[PDB]
Design a protein around this ligand. Structure first.
Ligand SMILES: [Zn+2]
Ligand SMILES: [Zn+2]
Ligand SMILES: [Zn+2]
Ligand SMILES: [Zn+2]
Lengths: 310, 310, 310, 310
């Protein structure tokens, strides 16, 4: 693992797992996404991980037109690296999923490193009523859902998006995902540095037990040595302890309303900025420091803000 | 983990990953499966893990009629526990996959604990020619293949097969599979003892690095304490070191031509019995001992040989 | 490991490793020790780990008369649990080392769980001049020094101090110390709960690599299950990351000028209270909470503040 | 860790922990040591780890004259590398301990990497009577014993024995010993390759739990990368499982009556050769292979058999 002299704080603004019923502070409209992205960047986020939602009901959408209603606006108001999801909403085809990144030609895109069960159905039991008709069926339908990323699908994404100079945020939900990445690294379909994002607490993925983070770092060191950066995200209540653990291990951090709707125990976060501010305070207490957007670009070896199609 | 006073040697006779071109000793016909199963049992295998193949070309098949051409014969010639696959051939639907276990009502059935990429396409590069037309497309098609076991699919299998008194061999290909099992254990859809089979070396699953075995045991201890038995299988050259490691850790062992076509380095195994004999010799050198079929039945708490439908 | 609903912050006020030349803020006199202990307790320290020093030159001393110049004063000004060292100054005999605890009959005493090389000689290279004649020879002499705690010595300490109702802070500097404790636990010379203090970063002990903390917790879980509390201290720059890691793992924390002379990177701590305040802020950011002295007494099952001989 | 293409089998012939009462097959006289060393070498031992004993009563002795009654004889009858203990008998001074290696100028000498409690007193409870007067007091006296290896002592041994071209077998009884070695490696007092011998199961050292071996390998990889060879020994019943684990991990193996008096469960070993033969059979079952003495010399980079003073 390459030691992160300056820590990259990534903010995942809204995602596609949480639904409108779950929090009145979930960013939905393009205008809310811009406002939240800017606030997160101003709090210290060097990178913004972005999904789009239907502006009226919050349903996940990979419509590039919705992305074009916030990407240019974010670019004009902040210098944060704009990271586009290729995961999108649960149930979308690969064509739908790659559309935004293909249209935008971003500096960074997420790249899910394996197929797994992705079960968020238990969340539905916490709510007796739902604001929109799509929410309960969406959550319930995940009991029989696989977030698909076959070796052929990964290779296609790497080839098509790699061609425009995109660098990837490799999302690794389990130990096997590290080995899946090693397969591609050995075939030279991606070049170092590898930005490895370990994901904890999803039902279908690796659990949010600390031993799992240290284990994944040990395996990543064995497979990739000094050619990778560690980043960490964890679901809900696990977010702060896991990203603090990452900082301590010489890694990078991902926070945001996509991953947890809470600022702290029993308290809904009113903004992405609250979580960015919190992890930054923790980092500072540990005598560590954060990366600026341009320091992050140099770490990830991105193509530059001026080379995108927005 | 419950310490295995007597070690269960499971023999996986033929499987569905290896193809006829790869070895002339791959058991194909029902008569070959009976002969091999009996030899494996006589060498010390307490349990036989079974798949069927098209008798003419070796193509994987979950036709219950093919199973009925070897199950009664095995039952009459050995007292080994007959474990029926619910994985079957790669590309089969869940209906096809559950058919043999539903017809046979076996003491044990395999139960795959999560969805994963299952890529055996690299095997094709080792052979310039193939005996049968189905082999190359089968292997190549795995680049875009997911061995599907959604939470809904797992629950269906547990409910339908649990109803006939079947005990499961829980196949865990990655750390997330342990957490997937814990979900069901917490909901009481399966009762202890849990026979956990950790699977190493599949491209799409956890790699065959020793640290992965000890890590999975640590996590299983945290999730299940004294309610589980550890078993281990590893692909190809990793088979013997991994099953020896399992024995040393107080676990059980799985060998067989399903998992490795080799008796030792650079030597094709002429029979399943060769591998069973080898692991038994290693066990004996370590001052350990193997379980008889009935000792295995008492460990797994099976319904008994007389309660099956064959 | 028993989960620490409320975290015990222990403050090690001065120790015997750091010398006066190293910081003008090192507490030396009994009056400085009282002032510092009170400030640390008021900042949130539930327990104070105490050593004495020669009031004129700061040389470590296990003279019970020096302890009696701060113990009654601390008892009157705070309700913090007073933990007396049985380690004392490097080079002292066991008779000298046990004298303060034997005289004071404290609620808690430290108990070093094994013999190890204890080399602090490298610290001398950071200073071209020393305030007092004893400092350089003290540090240099540690190259050929063993902090002695033989099985006979440990048994004597446990027997003599156990007789007065003392509970022990078991100081474990390496993995073997856990096994040394297990030997005594199996012989029932100490009763649960076991307050295990893992010590990282001493040359001669286990290094300050995160993997070592998680490993020691895994081994402690195997040896002691639910009968122990985890506490952690780390030398110098490692203090804050290690105690934060402990908090995240469900453990307790030890800070203080005994272990690190710094408040943060490149900044000498002016008081023990600075470090207590810092770890408390980190704890609060993680949505965790600290234990009051009486909550700590209930956790450790101490004899009570009124049952000491001061 | 450097992968051991050929495995070095070291045979520790007699040691100083086991006493004559414990087995009639314990090698005592110089003639017995020669006979046993030759048998062990002929069974496959590339290296012989040697201690001397009083020929009449078996009491440990570091008298160089006793070593000269077996070293020339071993050199003439086998080409095995002769490894001389600098540990010797428990209770000896460093002067006594270094005498044999200083006189012999061997290719290899053992080098204990830290001070620890070394308690073998529990062995006495297994015997109601003892053959010789020295045995019970020797064992009982270990309750209050430290195997001393201070940083000054280690440096002296490295300097004095390094001067004659000796390579060291670094005996590491706990994780802290790895860090102790790193201190010397960083100061260039020893040059690569480092032959690291991890020692499990001594009361006062790290316990014989498998996790401890994998952990020590992880730490050694972090501290020394590709500059070291792993070797393993374990006490009594732990010997075979631990050395088999080492083989599986790409390490080397140490067996012998010094470490275990047993050939297998409930069976006293009649000769060192029995254990060498057993580990060699296990190695061969795993499709691994052993090193010849000269292959071992090339691995360890020894000065050659002709450059010793015997
Ligand atoms: Zn996302
Ligand atoms: Zn199968
Ligand atoms: Zn202290
Ligand atoms: Zn020895």
């Amino acid at each position: 693992m390459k030691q992160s002299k300056k820590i990259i704080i990534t903010c995942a603004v809204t995602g596609s797992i949480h639904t409108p019923t779950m929090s009145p502070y979930l960013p939905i409209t393009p205008e809310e996404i811009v406002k939240e992205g800017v606030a997160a960047a101003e709090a210290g986020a060097a990178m913004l991980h972005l999904h789009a939602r239907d502006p009226l009901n919050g349903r996940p959408s990979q419509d590039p037109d919705l992305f074009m209603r916030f990407l240019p606006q974010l670019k004009e108001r902040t210098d944060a690296i704009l990271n586009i999801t290729t995961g999108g909403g649960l149930g979308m085809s690969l064509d739908e999923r790659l559309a935004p990144a293909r249209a935008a030609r971003p500096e960074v895109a997420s790249m899910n490193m394996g197929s797994l069960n992705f079960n968020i159905s238990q969340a539905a039991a916490k709510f007796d009523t739902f604001k929109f008709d799509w929410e309960r069926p969406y959550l319930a339908g995940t009991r029989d859902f696989i977030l698909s990323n076959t070796f052929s699908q990964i290779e296609r994404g790497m080839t098509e998006l790699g061609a425009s100079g995109t660098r990837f945020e490799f999302e690794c939900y389990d130990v096997g995902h590290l080995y899946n990445l090693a397969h591609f690294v050995d075939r030279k379909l991606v070049e170092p540095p590898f930005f490895l994002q370990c994901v904890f607490g999803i039902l279908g993925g690796i659990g949010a037990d600390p031993e799992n983070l240290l284990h994944m770092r040990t395996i990543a060191d064995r497979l990739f040595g000094q050619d990778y950066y560690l980043s960490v995200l964890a679901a809900g209540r696990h977010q702060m302890p896991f990203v603090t653990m990452s900082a301590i291990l010489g890694g990078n951090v991902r926070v945001g309303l996509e991953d947890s709707l809470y600022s702290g125990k029993g308290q809904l976060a009113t903004s992405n900025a609250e979580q960015v501010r919190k992890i930054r305070r923790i980092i500072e207490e540990l005598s560590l420091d954060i990366a600026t957007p341009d320091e992050a670009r140099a770490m990830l070896k991105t193509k530059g803000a001026n080379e995108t199609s927005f």
